[PDB]
Write a protein that binds this ligand. Sequence first.
Ligand code: ZN
Length: 258
Amino acid sequence: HHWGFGKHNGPEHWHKDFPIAKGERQSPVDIDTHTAKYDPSLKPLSVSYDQATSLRILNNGHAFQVEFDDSQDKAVLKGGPLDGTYRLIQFHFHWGSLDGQGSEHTVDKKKYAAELHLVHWNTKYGDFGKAVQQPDGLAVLGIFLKVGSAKPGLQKVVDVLDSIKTKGKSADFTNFDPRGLLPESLDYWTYPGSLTTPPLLECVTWIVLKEPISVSSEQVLKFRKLNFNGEGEPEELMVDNWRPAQPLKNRQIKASFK
Ligand SMILES: [Zn+2]
């Protein structure tokens, strides 16, 4: 009876196994655009993905994750609110059963159809496992998805999902360029928060882009054909794998733009 997104093990239950669920810097949060302060010290976000090396895509039982070779400085995030260099390790999404919900962060209470997380770890901690034990261990770049025109750069991801339908399935996924998932503007909000799946560690500097990317209805529909369950088990569609907004508590969200 482990954590999940069902009726008996979903986000409202997680605190029982992971008490930090009720912590002081939990994510996601609602971004109140009128309360976020423009910060004239925030540098432009530097995203250097030209040498990114994807390896594999995995159905991990709550989402799918595209993993990268992070053994060299190849795909790095720096600048913005960050000190130092953070290396890309994986990206994954959160999505809904319907276009009207699916994002984890919300903007003035608005829910998007999905949310992309590009997860990076602080190179000063040597690897991901050590980084998540530190308050500044991770930087996660969050990008909202809305349903409209197709995102061509996403299609290679959508087309491989049939091969990883059920929990535990993985597939070779090389030469995928995550630059094809970025919106035009890198304007962002930033605040200190946490992983949004257990163990919910409070190790993340969140950088959430203001500009959503558009994906097609057909693209998001294919996300919804994935399964939470393993092969040979009763079918449960992988939908609504998003944690709802958590109390902001003692935190200020800063904006890179006015
Ligand atoms: Zn996530």
